[PDB]
């Protein structure tokens, strides 16, 4: 049918920036394009309707435009409120057709990761399975590998990694890494720790704890 | 006071049948076209059906052609969508739109989204779990083993919130979801204050207040 290709999927913009997110058609579909802000965890929000129409409620630093075929999302000054992603849409033809998508994050000083870490929980141990946390808190940007030694061997794949959005203060982020084991592996060892590696940090940190000690 | 209500997801075997529930407030839906829009967990928006309540002229997205039905009922302002033969694939949050001026405003109001999950694992309550730590002091809860999505995590009743973090949920090899939620506190309050993870949990009708203290 139609497609809709909206560019790019990721953007970081500080505070006052000039966004603009460009959303290409297949075809002809004149100004039947409109644009949605989508906060994390609620649901979409109109924007611009018909091509280059604001709707009513939304501020006057959100316009759209039409050439041809390529409508752009334009945010005059960006606010910290923005952090969302951003879909297009056309109905022109039946099936209206959405976009990629561009999640929109905001730009900052780059900030060093708070390192913790957990040792498993003995109302866990109970029930033969153990559970070793690394936090990593507040920091920018959002890359960073977190990397487990045992025993100071450096293990693999028995741990997952999950990233909050963007705090609404200091716009960072947040990581757990959760090393998941079992009572009959957690205690054939001694030695427990996370390393981290950020941007904000000089050299890997390391956080560790000796089981019992 | 314009709004739509969804309702009637949740959990549903593979293949089975699942009806979902539009009500409108504000406006009557004879007037305008009513959509179905949903949102895989974590992938973009994907329209499914349109309906016009006046006559019932239904168009239905080709990939739940012959599967899906979309009904209305101007007596009751409220939509549906009859969804059949259901795959992991249909897993996804349902929103309901309509069409402002016919077609000119786009989809201009969507509903709150309800969930709907296609799985054959039964559901399951979570273990909450303590995190001592050694302002260097953090701690937190850890939800772990539970099925499925959503799960509720307050601390101290809702009074502490300055400094939380809850972790989405990471989908575990065994199937089930499992997520932390800490909080940043100062140290000077260890042995004083007392710190209480509030894990709600609605589908298994569990709901767990473990304290947090070394």
């Known amino acids: 049918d139609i497609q809709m290709t909206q560019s790019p999927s990721s953007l970081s913009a500080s505070v006052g920036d000039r966004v603009t997110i460009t959303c290409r058609a297949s075809?002809?579909?004149?100004?039947?394009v409109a644009w949605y802000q989508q906060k994390p965890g609620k649901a979409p929000k109109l924007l611009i309707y018909s091509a280059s129409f604001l709707y009513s409620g939304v501020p006057s630093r959100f316009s759209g435009s039409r050439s041809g075929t390529d409508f752009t999302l334009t945010i005059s000054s960006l606010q910290p409120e923005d952090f969302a992603t951003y879909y297009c849409?056309?109905?022109?033809?039946?099936?209206?057709?959405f976009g990629q998508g561009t999640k929109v994050e905001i730009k900052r000083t780059v900030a060093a990761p708070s390192v913790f870490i957990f040792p498993p929980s003995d109302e866990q141990l109970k029930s033969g399975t153990a559970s070793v946390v690394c936090l990593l808190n507040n920091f920018y940007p959002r890359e960073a590998k977190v990397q487990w030694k045992v025993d100071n061997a450096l293990x693999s794949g028995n741990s997952q990694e999950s990233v909050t959005e963007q705090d609404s203060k200091d716009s960072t982020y947040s990581l757990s890494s959760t090393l998941t084991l079992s009572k009959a592996d957690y205690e054939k060892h001694k030695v427990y720790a996370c390393e981290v590696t950020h941007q904000g940090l000089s050299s890997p940190v390391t956080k560790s704890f000796n089981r019992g000690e | 006071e314009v709004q739509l209500v969804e309702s009637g997801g949740g959990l549903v075997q593979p293949g089975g049948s699942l009806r979902l529930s539009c009500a409108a407030s504000?406006?009557?839906?004879?007037?305008?076209?009513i959509h179905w829009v949903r949102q895989a967990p974590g992938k973009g928006l994907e329209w499914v059906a349109r309906?016009?309540?006046?006559?019932?002229?239904?168009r239905y997205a080709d990939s739940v052609k012959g599967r899906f039905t979309i009904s209305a009922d101007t007596s009751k302002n409220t939509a549906y969508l009859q969804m059949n033969s259901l795959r992991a694939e249909d897993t996804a949050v349902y929103y309901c739109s309509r069409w402002g001026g016919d077609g000119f405003y786009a989809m201009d109001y969507w509903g709150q989204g309800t969930l709907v999950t296609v799985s054959s694992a039964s559901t399951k309550g979570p273990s909450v779990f303590p995190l001592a730590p050694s302002g260097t002091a953090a701690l937190g809860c850890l939800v772990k083993d539970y099925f499925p999505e959503p799960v509720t995590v307050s601390w101290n009743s809702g009074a502490l919130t300055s400094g939380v973090h809850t972790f989405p949920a990471v989908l575990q090899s065994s199937g089930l979801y499992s997520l932390s939620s800490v909080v940043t506190v100062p140290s000077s309050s260890l042995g004083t204050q007392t710190y209480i993870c509030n894990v709600n949990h609605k589908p298994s009708n569990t709901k767990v207040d473990k304290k947090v203290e070394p």
């Open positions: 309906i016009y309540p006046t006559n019932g002229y239904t």
């Open positions: 849409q056309q109905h022109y033809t039946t099936p209206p057709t």
């Open positions: 504000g406006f009557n839906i004879k007037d305008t076209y």
């Open positions: 075809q002809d579909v004149n100004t039947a």
